[PDB]
Design a protein around this ligand. Sequence first.
Ligand SMILES: *[C@@H]1O[C@H](CO)[C@@H](O[C@@H]2O[C@H](CO)[C@@H](O)[C@H](O)[C@H]2NC(C)=O)[C@H](O)[C@H]1NC(C)=O
Ligand SMILES: *[C@@H]1O[C@H](CO)[C@@H](O[C@@H]2O[C@H](CO)[C@@H](O)[C@H](O)[C@H]2NC(C)=O)[C@H](O)[C@H]1NC(C)=O
Ligand SMILES: *[C@@H]1O[C@H](CO)[C@@H](O)[C@H](O)[C@H]1NC(C)=O
Ligand SMILES: *[C@@H]1O[C@H](CO)[C@@H](O)[C@H](O)[C@H]1NC(C)=O
Ligand SMILES: *[C@@H]1O[C@H](CO)[C@@H](O)[C@H](O)[C@H]1NC(C)=O
Ligand SMILES: *[C@@H]1O[C@H](CO)[C@@H](O)[C@H](O)[C@H]1NC(C)=O
Ligand SMILES: *[C@@H]1O[C@H](CO)[C@@H](O)[C@H](O)[C@H]1NC(C)=O
Ligand SMILES: *[C@@H]1O[C@H](CO)[C@@H](O)[C@H](O)[C@H]1NC(C)=O
Ligand SMILES: *[C@@H]1O[C@H](CO)[C@@H](O)[C@H](O)[C@H]1NC(C)=O
Ligand SMILES: *[C@@H]1O[C@H](CO)[C@@H](O)[C@H](O)[C@H]1NC(C)=O
Ligand SMILES: *[C@@H]1O[C@H](CO)[C@@H](O)[C@H](O)[C@H]1NC(C)=O
Ligand SMILES: *[C@@H]1O[C@H](CO)[C@@H](O)[C@H](O)[C@H]1NC(C)=O
Ligand SMILES: [K+]
Ligand SMILES: [K+]
Lengths: 358, 358
Amino acid sequence: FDNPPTNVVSHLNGDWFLFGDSRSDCNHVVNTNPRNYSYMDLNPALCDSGKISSKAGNSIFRSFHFTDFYNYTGEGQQIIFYEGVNFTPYHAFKCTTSGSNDIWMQNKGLFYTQVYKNMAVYRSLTFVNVPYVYNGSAQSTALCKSGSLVLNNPAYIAREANFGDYYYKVEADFYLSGCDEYIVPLCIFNGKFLSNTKYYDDSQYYFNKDTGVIYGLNSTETITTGFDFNCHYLVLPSGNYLAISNELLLTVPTKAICLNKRKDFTPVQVVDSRWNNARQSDNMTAVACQPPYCYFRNSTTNYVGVYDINHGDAGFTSILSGLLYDSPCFSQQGVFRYDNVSSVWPLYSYGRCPTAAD
Amino acid sequence: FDNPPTNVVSHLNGDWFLFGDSRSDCNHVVNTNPRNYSYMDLNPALCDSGKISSKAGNSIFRSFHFTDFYNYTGEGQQIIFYEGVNFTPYHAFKCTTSGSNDIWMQNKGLFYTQVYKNMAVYRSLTFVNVPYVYNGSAQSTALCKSGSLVLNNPAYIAREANFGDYYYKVEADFYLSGCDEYIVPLCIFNGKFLSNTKYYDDSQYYFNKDTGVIYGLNSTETITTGFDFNCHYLVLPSGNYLAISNELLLTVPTKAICLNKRKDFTPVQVVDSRWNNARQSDNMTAVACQPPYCYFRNSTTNYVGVYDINHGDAGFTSILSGLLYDSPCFSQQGVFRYDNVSSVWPLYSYGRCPTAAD
Ligand SMILES: *[C@@H]1O[C@H](CO)[C@@H](O[C@@H]2O[C@H](CO)[C@@H](O)[C@H](O)[C@H]2NC(C)=O)[C@H](O)[C@H]1NC(C)=O
Ligand SMILES: *[C@@H]1O[C@H](CO)[C@@H](O[C@@H]2O[C@H](CO)[C@@H](O)[C@H](O)[C@H]2NC(C)=O)[C@H](O)[C@H]1NC(C)=O
Ligand SMILES: *[C@@H]1O[C@H](CO)[C@@H](O)[C@H](O)[C@H]1NC(C)=O
Ligand SMILES: *[C@@H]1O[C@H](CO)[C@@H](O)[C@H](O)[C@H]1NC(C)=O
Ligand SMILES: *[C@@H]1O[C@H](CO)[C@@H](O)[C@H](O)[C@H]1NC(C)=O
Ligand SMILES: *[C@@H]1O[C@H](CO)[C@@H](O)[C@H](O)[C@H]1NC(C)=O
Ligand SMILES: *[C@@H]1O[C@H](CO)[C@@H](O)[C@H](O)[C@H]1NC(C)=O
Ligand SMILES: *[C@@H]1O[C@H](CO)[C@@H](O)[C@H](O)[C@H]1NC(C)=O
Ligand SMILES: *[C@@H]1O[C@H](CO)[C@@H](O)[C@H](O)[C@H]1NC(C)=O
Ligand SMILES: *[C@@H]1O[C@H](CO)[C@@H](O)[C@H](O)[C@H]1NC(C)=O
Ligand SMILES: *[C@@H]1O[C@H](CO)[C@@H](O)[C@H](O)[C@H]1NC(C)=O
Ligand SMILES: *[C@@H]1O[C@H](CO)[C@@H](O)[C@H](O)[C@H]1NC(C)=O
Ligand SMILES: [K+]
Ligand SMILES: [K+]
């Protein structure tokens, strides 16, 4: 008899949900000709489950920040993630041509940290539009973009007519309703930002009008190039807020991760989302995925897909195959198929776990 | 054979530490005449262990905020707490005679939340003085006090000569060094605060000069009485900060909980700290102590001490008796003395835990 920790994502019972990309997007098949499911690491037998929210070409972080949006939506006791690759160093995103992808990688890490920690304690994830009102005549402007990637959260608001510089203070009201909590971005250009001969230090506050909490960021970097848009990801309660800009462009959330239905602490499961080695990926979801709130799973091999080089891999197929059955015990070392006896002690465990005793 | 969850605090191995009050203060015996150890719930056999930091009459929260200070200091993989009672509704603390103890109870809850969560991930706790520099000629002032309790963290700084009201903006620099992280208070009077015919709305920011993060609180309450000094407990990194007051009195930290030596996640154990029923206690440490980071233990009886009514209780003695031996498994339901078989599945477990399987 053998009850080793196995390298899969699974579920204690039927109460689970997976968030993904093309490698688990059952709907993508209609855009394959001929129709072929092999682009998936997910077993298509799960295509009718109602337990997956995945979109080819997308990722939760991508959708959170950019116009290339998919309304990831799902609910489960145990939450599983297999996405992230669709925002990687490969995409070489930077707000401007003189920016830094490293900043965007740092953002990615901070985002998924909040997502993983919070989905250990809420059943439900979706996206909600965040309404805001700005009183001036200036409109939103797409100042952060690169290739086909256009940032739209937070929004930037253009300077008013009548101002000649960026030393102005302006504000907007944004309102959060419909969720227990909300993940929103608070961002600044962190660097010496040149505009018409003057160097700016971006400053942005958000203010909960009723709790009285001020959350702010001011630029502190001295470099005049190779800097970018640094974001923090706030986890906020419902209420009415001001976005108060003290320098450069006013920024205000336009989308939030909507967290609902508080649950008993239940660690999330996260599968490494990377390209075949020929493209540059990152380890930001690995950094984000820590005990006790997250179990991280990865294959021991290069990602070599059979449909194309980046889709349909033996190693990841195997990891996801655990979704085809119930398993009693989840641990840092893996998933145990039996709840009785083992030869290793499950670490940071959840479920009905075996003893490594005599 | 029986392996039930037992209602004790214990330790997997020798690597543990307890923080306490008189009920575990071995040094207090010298102030008993004749010398009598019965005032303790702790077994005096543990008096030579070097694993306890306790002080009669005190509590971590009491020491954090007030002049009645004890430099709680300790290091351990598993941290245990048996204190809190020395700041309870019984003490009826409020900053002023028109204040609210409920505010102070809320503060207490928020404080211990940060302490418990963080001692699940650091080995070492102590207190450090926080140096600050204020540039004006005004001095600190003891504006918050009641009975023998005098608040000294955060400090209040008096108004300068030359100001006739409290609509002024002033600041201080405070510096955090010597720890991986620091718990400090950020507080305001949350209410309409009357001074010489004018009503104030206290405003306080802290600013990390190098990370650029602004942490602020502004008063939002409309009540003109029955309000008090609301505190939030920030967990900050080392660095150089400004305390920027925008209204009422400038407040600045004078003490921090000093957190050191990052460790693998290890839930803390917390024992209910209450008076005999004849005095008013609170459940704030219970609220603070949640899975996965904390196990809460309580007796099923009134606290009836044998030394005096508030010291040396059978129920709490029993809970603490588990410190006299190693135990393999810690769980929400209790401590399991054996790591092999049981009849219940350990929840949120840590250590070598039994199976409830066949
Ligand atoms: C954050 O940045 C803002 C904007 O740069 C700072 O506010 C400005 O501070 C300078 C003083 O250095 C003044 O000249 C401006 O009038 C201020 N603008 C305002 C208030 O709109 C702000 O003080 C910084 N926040 C801190 C340091 O906590
Ligand atoms: C927090 O409170 C402060 C102090 O009351 C606010 O700053 C003052 O705002 C009023 C405008 O209502 C002005 O009359 C004062 O000149 C401001 N004082 C300063 C800047 O020292 C502050 O705006 C509030 N913070 C918010 C709303 O985020
Ligand atoms: C995402 O879908 C959810 C569930 O239908 C809906 O409430 C929410 O408004 C959607 N968010 C969008 C379209 O931004
Ligand atoms: C996943 O495993 C592969 C193959 O061992 C390795 O190259 C890669 O760095 C791992 N990814 C992370 C995020 O650890
Ligand atoms: C991620 O990569 C960095 C190197 O860039 C490394 O120092 C870090 O430990 C890695 N973390 C994980 C969790 O793989
Ligand atoms: C799907 O593509 C895979 C990999 O290219 C290949 O094995 C197979 O020919 C295709 N299957 C069908 C039914 O066309
Ligand atoms: C553990 O469970 C498996 C499957 O039921 C069984 O074959 C094995 O003998 C069991 N071992 C025990 C109870 O020691
Ligand atoms: C508490 O004791 C520790 C350890 O000796 C010391 O570093 C620290 O300064 C003390 N804190 C005080 C006296 O505030
Ligand atoms: C501890 O138990 C006693 C006796 O059952 C009960 O009265 C008390 O409320 C409990 N305290 C907390 C904080 O739950
Ligand atoms: C603490 O007491 C309040 C009533 O004041 C109650 O609503 C709350 O559930 C209690 N919490 C715990 C953890 O005992
Ligand atoms: C200590 O006090 C306890 C409780 O009052 C009592 O049983 C005993 O007389 C005392 N013990 C000694 C050695 O004096
Ligand atoms: C569990 O351990 C206890 C103490 O060693 C022993 O008496 C009992 O029989 C064991 N039961 C098992 C291994 O089933
Ligand atoms: K701004
Ligand atoms: K103040």
